[PDB]
Amino acid sequence: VYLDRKLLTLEDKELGSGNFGTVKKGYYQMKKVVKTVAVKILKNPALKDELLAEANVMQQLDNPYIVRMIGICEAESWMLVMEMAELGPLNKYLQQNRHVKDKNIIELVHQVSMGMKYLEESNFVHRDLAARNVLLVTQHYAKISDFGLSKALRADENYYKAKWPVKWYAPECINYYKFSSKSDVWSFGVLMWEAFSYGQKPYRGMKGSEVTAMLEKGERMGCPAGCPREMYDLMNLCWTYDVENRPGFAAVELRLRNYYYDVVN
């Protein structure tokens, strides 16, 4: 799972840019066929362990609706090589594809729920589940990306305990610093609202404490325009305040599954 640098060929263009460095499109030369890849390149304080951690999480993961890691490449700077989802972030796609029918959005978010169902079974917490971190291969095929804040849970516990996306975070994450798969279900609820709002930002114009204050009164984001009423119930079900009463992805996937096939039938 260590890749040869002379086989890789990177573009000059950047896809994304953070403190890590860059994300660039490229081509990894396989047996005969050449595979297209998205490569996360590094920019020097020992934040190289953070990248190794992300690679180590993706190494263990293996699922249709998760971004696959091809391997690591030590050359000039550290590089996390992944398979290429050509259409990009879900939020940005839906922003500039308003024609996308509501059936198609149910399909795309149900795919995310199945990836998180696997993530829950595999005992990993994502901790950054947003519409920006869902990448599209096709209009009808999504993958969950960005495992930089992801943690593998121990066999005895069922939460991790700790620059946060407060708008995607559950009450227990803000108050108690406790991250479980139920905390990701909360984030999936915000991700659903994002998708049915066509990539609109949640809690628009509000600060973290104002969002925290709003949610404590029992006030939740309203049903976005054209969103099916059964899908909006699932958002509010994902936004259960109590951690224990909130459903896991098994339940979230099962409702999205059943509802989806009453639309296509």
The residues annotated as belonging to the active site are 128
Q: 115 a known binding residue?
A: no
* Beta strand segments in the chain, E: 8-10, 21-29, 34-42, 69-75, 77-83, 88-89, 124-125, 134-138, 141-144, 151-152, 160-161, 178-179
Q: Which residue is nearest to ligand X5G (CB)?
A: 88
Which CB, 17 or 158, lies closer to ligand X5G? 17
Distance CA 194, CA 109 (A): 10
Residues that bind ligand X5G (CB under 6 A): 15-16, 23, 38, 40, 67, 82, 84-85, 88-89, 132-133, 135, 145-146
Which CB, 131 or 243, lies closer to ligand X5G? 131
Task: State the helix-helix crossing angle for 249-261 and 102-121, rounded to 10 degrees.
Answer: 150
CB of 246 to ligand X5G, least distance (A): 26
Q: 19 a known binding residue?
A: yes
CB of 55 to ligand X5G, least distance (A): 11
Distance CA 128, CA 118 (A): 16
CA distances for 14 relative to 150, 218, 251, angstroms: 24, 42, 39
Give the residue from 248, 230, 259, 262 showing the smallest Cα distance to 119: 248
Which CB, 188 or 239, lies closer to ligand X5G? 188
CB of 244 to ligand X5G, least distance (A): 31
Which CB, 89 or 171, lies closer to ligand X5G? 89
Q: 197 a known binding residue?
A: no
Q: Where are the alpha helices (DSSP H) in 122-228?
A: 171-175, 181-196, 208-216
| DSSP bridge partners of 152 | 124
Q: 23 a known binding residue?
A: yes
CB of 20 to ligand X5G, least distance (A): 8
Q: 254 a known binding residue?
A: no
Residue numbers in the known binding site for ATP are: 15-23, 40
Residue numbers in the known binding site are: 15-23, 40
